[PDB]
Amino acid sequence: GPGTWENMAFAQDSSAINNINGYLSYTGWYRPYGTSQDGKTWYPTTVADWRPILMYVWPSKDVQVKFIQYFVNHGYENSNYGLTAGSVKDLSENTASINLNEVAQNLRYVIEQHIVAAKSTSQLANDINNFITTIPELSASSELPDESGYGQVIFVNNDNTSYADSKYRLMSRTINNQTGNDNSGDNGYEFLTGIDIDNSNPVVQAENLNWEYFLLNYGKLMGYNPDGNFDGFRIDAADHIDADVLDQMGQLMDDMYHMKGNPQNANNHLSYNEGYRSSAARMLNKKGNPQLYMDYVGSTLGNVLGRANNRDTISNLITGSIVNRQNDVTENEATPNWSFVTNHDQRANLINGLIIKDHPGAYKAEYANQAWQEFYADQKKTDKQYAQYNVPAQYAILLSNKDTVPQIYYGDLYNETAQYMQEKSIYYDAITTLMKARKQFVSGGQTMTKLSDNLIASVRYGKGVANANSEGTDSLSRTSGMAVIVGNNPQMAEQTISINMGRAHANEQYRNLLDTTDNGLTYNADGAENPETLTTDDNGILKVTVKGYSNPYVSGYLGVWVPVVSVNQDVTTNAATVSADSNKIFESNAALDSHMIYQDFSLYQPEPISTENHAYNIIAQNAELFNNLGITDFWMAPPYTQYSESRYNDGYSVTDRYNLGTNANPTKYGSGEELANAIAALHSAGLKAQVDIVMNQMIGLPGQEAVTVTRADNRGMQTDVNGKTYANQMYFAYTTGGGNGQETYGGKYLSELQSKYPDLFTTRAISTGVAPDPTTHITKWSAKYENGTSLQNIGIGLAVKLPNGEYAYLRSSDNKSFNTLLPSEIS
Numbered sequence: 001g002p003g004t005w006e007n008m009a010f011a012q013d014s015s016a017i018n019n020i021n022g023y024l025s026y027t028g029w030y031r032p033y034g035t036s037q038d039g040k041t042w043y044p045t046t047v048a049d050w051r052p053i054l055m056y057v058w059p060s061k062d063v064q065v066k067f068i069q070y071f072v073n074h075g076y077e078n079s080n081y082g083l084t085a086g087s088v089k090d091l092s093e094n095t096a097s098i099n100l101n102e103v104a105q106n107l108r109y110v111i112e113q114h115i116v117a118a119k120s121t122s123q124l125a126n127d128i129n130n131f132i133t134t135i136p137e138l139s140a141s142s143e144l145p146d147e148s149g150y151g152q153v154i155f156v157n158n159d160n161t162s163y164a165d166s167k168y169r170l171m172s173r174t175i176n177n178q179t180g181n182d183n184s185g186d187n188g189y190e191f192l193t194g195i196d197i198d199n200s201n202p203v204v205q206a207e208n209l210n211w212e213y214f215l216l217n218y219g220k221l222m223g224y225n226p227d228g229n230f231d232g233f234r235i236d237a238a239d240h241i242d243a244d245v246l247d248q249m250g251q252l253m254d255d256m257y258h259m260k261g262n263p264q265n266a267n268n269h270l271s272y273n274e275g276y277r278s279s280a281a282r283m284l285n286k287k288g289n290p291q292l293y294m295d296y297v298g299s300t301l302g303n304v305l306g307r308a309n310n311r312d313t314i315s316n317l318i319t320g321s322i323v324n325r326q327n328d329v330t331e332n333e334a335t336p337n338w339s340f341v342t343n344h345d346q347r348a349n350l351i352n353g354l355i356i357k358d359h360p361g362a363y364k365a366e367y368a369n370q371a372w373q374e375f376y377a378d379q380k381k382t383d384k385q386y387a388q389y390n391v392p393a394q395y396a397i398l399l400s401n402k403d404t405v406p407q408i409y410y411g412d413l414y415n416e417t418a419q420y421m422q423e424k425s426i427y428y429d430a431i432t433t434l435m436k437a438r439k440q441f442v443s444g445g446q447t448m449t450k451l452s453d454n455l456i457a458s459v460r461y462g463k464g465v466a467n468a469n470s471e472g473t474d475s476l477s478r479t480s481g482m483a484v485i486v487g488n489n490p491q492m493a494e495q496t497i498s499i500n501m502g503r504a505h506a507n508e509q510y511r512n513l514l515d516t517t518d519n520g521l522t523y524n525a526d527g528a529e530n531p532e533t534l535t536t537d538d539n540g541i542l543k544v545t546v547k548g549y550s551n552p553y554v555s556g557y558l559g560v561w562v563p564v565v566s567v568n569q570d571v572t573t574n575a576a577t578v579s580a581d582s583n584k585i586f587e588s589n590a591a592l593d594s595h596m597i598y599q600d601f602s603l604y605q606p607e608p609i610s611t612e613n614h615a616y617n618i619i620a621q622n623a624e625l626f627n628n629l630g631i632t633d634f635w636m637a638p639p640y641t642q643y644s645e646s647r648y649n650d651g652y653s654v655t656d657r658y659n660l661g662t663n664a665n666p667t668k669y670g671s672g673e674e675l676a677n678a679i680a681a682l683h684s685a686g687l688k689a690q691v692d693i694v695m696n697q698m699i700g701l702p703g704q705e706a707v708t709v710t711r712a713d714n715r716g717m718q719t720d721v722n723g724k725t726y727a728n729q730m731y732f733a734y735t736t737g738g739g740n741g742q743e744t745y746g747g748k749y750l751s752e753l754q755s756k757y758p759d760l761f762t763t764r765a766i767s768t769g770v771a772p773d774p775t776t777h778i779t780k781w782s783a784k785y786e787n788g789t790s791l792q793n794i795g796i797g798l799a800v801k802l803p804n805g806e807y808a809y810l811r812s813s814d815n816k817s818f819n820t821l822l823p824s825e826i827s
């Protein structure tokens with residue numbers, strides 16, 4: 001026998017009603033006790049007969065009304081049940097509740113018809129989704145994107161989502177705001193993108209140590225190649241995570257390798273933080289430099305040399321860095337830093353931006369093949385529109401620059417979208433040439449001198465020659481040093497210059513290492529304005545001829561001079577095993593300057609086709625190459641398992657922090673077996689490997705949680721996006737995951753870490769006043785360990801509220817707190 005009592009759910013548990021943490025969604029599906037198509041015969045449902053909630057329950061009558069009209073005007077009209085555009089067009093929130101429901105019940109008969117006709121609940125589901133977008137309060141737009149399509153919410157405490165409550169979530173505790181005592185200042189904000197991890201929670205801080213220890217012992221712990229272990233870190237988003245963790249990493253690295261005393265041990269376990277805010281240098285300096293500061297000089301370099309229009313004066317290569325090189329003749333004073341011409345984020349900014357120019361802010365279909373073709377094309381032209389001008393000159397500056405650990409971009413040596421290392425860039429010959437010159441000649445003090453608003457001479461005086469007047473200590477002193485002349489005006493008048501090479505280089509012969517020509521660069525003097533060898537006068541002054549050139553390699557002038565020698569030479573300074581200062585980890589000096597970093601990836605690095613093309617395998621094959629190039633320290637891509645749907649599959653979208661790929665399931669870069677082998681190939685050639693460690697976010701966690709949220713600016717303070725705002729809302733965010741990796745390995749090394757190094761777990765963190773807590777392992781990430789998430793494209797009106805004001809609820813399984821309460825139309 002039949003009746004409408006059967007719209008009732010078959011059971012008020014999770015087996016028949018969709019719920020997240022006990023709560024219901026208007027996008028949710030449930031199993032009624034029965035359905036009907038005509039009104040007369042009602043059929044019991046099978047456990048496979050599931051129907052969307054938005055057919056039976058609505059946020060308000062206004063919405064019930066729009067659900068009815070939308071469905072009718074989209075294929076679900078039937079006049080034999082009184083449903084045509086004509087029968088629904090006058091209905092409104094003012095209509096009798098008793099009438100509207102009869103109309104809704106009749107629509108439901110028609111929906112059952114379409115399901116029968118189509119033999120599936122697909123077009124229904126696709127219609128529910130399309131319907132929802134029409135409704136302001138129910139749509140993704142209710143979560144209030146900003147005008148650029150960006151935004152974040154914060155996770156807060158709430159009586160309904162109390163399992164997601166935290167005592168911590170200290171936000172934007174970065175840099176000089178580790179104590180939360182200058183929120184208004186120069187810190188660096190909490191939220192980038194993704195599900196933001198609360199690195200202020202003591203338990204999280206313990207998990208970060210666990211992680212770091214696994215990574216520093218990767219090959220061993222995983223039973224892969226046992227010499228396949230990382231030596232250090234590149235810290236992603238370091239300005240955007242509670243600075244406690246940077247303290248804590250420092251401490252682990254000091255405990256494990258004894259770095260404070262020994263520059264040799266410090267220098268063999270290099271770490272560098274991504275983050276250029278000058279406040280960051282201050283912080284690092286005040287802390288004794290546990291990591292290397294990221295210097296801003298690449299930005300200067302692109303601004304002075306790289307632009308087509310609007311080029312900043314040449315003097316800025318002198319002062320536009322955390323190090324002033326007007327005349328830098330001292331050691332252990334500079335902030336220990338790493339610098340570059342290009343990084344992964346600059347190259348992406350440019351390719352995106354080309355994407356929106358070539359397609360009017362449109363649907364982002366993958367015409368990034370189009371942007372990349374345009375880049376390669378502009379790259380080769382003299383009169384470039386986008387791509388950096390003067391790329392050889394920028395590396396000339398960087399590789400001659402004292403008091404930095406320079407970082408080379410894979411993409412500046414190779415065509416980054418072709419298969420890994422398959423295609424050398426046009427800039428390969430220049431750069432590699434300058435890299436090899438560095439090992440052989442670049443040492444001693446530095447003087448950068450203006451000779452025009454557009455011309456500069458950067459001279460290094462050679463190993464063991466501290467400044468212009470020094471005689472020379474080292475036996476390489478005489479035959480080392482370098483002049484790098486850079487002009488940034490292609491119209492510069494032909495002219496003679498003088499370059500003071502220092503008193504250590506009176507009456508000395510100088511090879512034309514690299515000079516500009518009509519077509520580009522010559523490596524042997526052919527076609528330049530200067531001969532292959534020149535000699536200094538009795539005062540050590542070099543006379544050189546320079547002019548403006550304009551071709552794909554140079555828009556300005558570039559020339560490099562190094563001493564003539566008969567032999568290979570290496571001016572690298574070994575570090576001693578007791579430091580000029582016991583308060584310091586890293587020190588900016590000859591030893592640290594002898595290091596050189598290589599970024600071994602690009603975000604637009606293509607998926608490997610075969611196993612032979614795994615970057616890890618190709619890296620293990622060319623270890624000696626990097627070594628030959630004077631590279632000492634290999635920055636490797638985040639090797640973690642990624643979100644399936646990610647744009648670039650590049651490493652920053654982390655889904656498992658411990659799964660670095662297996663034989664059948666590699667990252668873009670390869671399997672973890674293969675990772676270990678590359679690492680050990682590098683070691684075998686005397687190089688060191690650092691891992692990109694991503695403590696800031698995870699992206700693609702599959703498990704939804706009901707959490708309570710407040711539309712917030714990117715510092716975790718509530719914001720008032722175009723008039724509107726919202727606080728204390730229920731939100732069904734994706735917050736939970738980790739992979740088997742987080743489960744197998746999460747917290748596993750903490751007892752070993754406590755036994756060997758107890759100070760880690762007694763040292764009170766600055767932001768919390770409380771030491772990392774190793775007594776709870778994290779085997780799965782969830783909201784309780786997260787500050788919030790970037791906007792997730794779901795909307796804020798999904799949570800079902802009963803007419804009386806309370807959210808609908810189910811005592812389900814783990815969900816057993818309060819008393820069950822379902823809508824009228826489901827019981």
Ligand SMILES: OC[C@H]1O[C@H](O[C@H]2[C@H](O)[C@@H](O)[C@@H](O[C@H]3[C@H](O)[C@@H](O)[C@@H](O[C@H]4[C@H](O)[C@@H](O)[C@@H](O[C@H]5[C@H](O)[C@@H](O)[C@@H](O[C@H]6[C@H](O)[C@@H](O)[C@@H](O)O[C@@H]6CO)O[C@@H]5CO)O[C@@H]4CO)O[C@@H]3CO)O[C@@H]2CO)[C@H](O)[C@@H](O)[C@@H]1O
Nearest residue numbers: 607608609610611641642643644649664665666667668669
């Ligand atoms: O395409 C083959 C080619 O892949 C490599 O390049 C890949 C890259 O390194 C890797 O990161 C990946 O990135 C994405 C991936 O593109 C996504 O598809 C996604 O992967 C999930 C995927 O959606 C699912 O299909 C599923 O994948 C696997 C099983 O779990 C595997 O065990 C495997 O089983 C066998 C299969 O049945 C056979 O037909 C045969 O292929 O042999 C397999 C055993 O070796 O394949 C199924 C699918 O058939 O689960 C995946 C999640 O783990 O998410 C990844 C990011 O998370 O995709 C790149 C290519 O698009 C690699 O370089 C080449 O060597 C390789 O031959």
Ligand code: NA
Nearest residue numbers: 190240241696
């Ligand atoms: Na953060």
